[PDB]
């Protein structure tokens, strides 16, 4: 699980651009305030390599 990808972001990246910011994403109308919960998910998820 050492390899992670950005599942959620507000906008698409530019060419040759890396995003490593571990900020929470707001998927709904309600603000998340940096805390996980309903419709608040972490952007980086790990691959299940077996």
């Amino acid at each position: 699980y050492n390899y992670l990808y950005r599942l959620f972001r507000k906008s698409n990246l530019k060419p040759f651009e890396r995003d490593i910011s571990t900020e929470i994403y707001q998927a709904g109308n309600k603000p998340c305030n940096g805390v996980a919960g309903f419709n608040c998910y972490f952007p980086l998820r790990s691959y299940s390599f077996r």
Binding site: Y3, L4, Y5, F16, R18, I20
Partner: protein, 50 residues
Amino acid sequence: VYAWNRKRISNCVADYSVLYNLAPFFTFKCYGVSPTKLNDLCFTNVYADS
């Protein structure tokens, strides 16, 4: 992939023939340059994104 490593290749002579002849790489696909012409050209501002 979210934190992909970019390495600069500079001030070296590169033999690309040893990359083509080896069989472990499933995909060797080039877009802006011919694969067989890489040994005959000179380049700068070279980066490997891993």
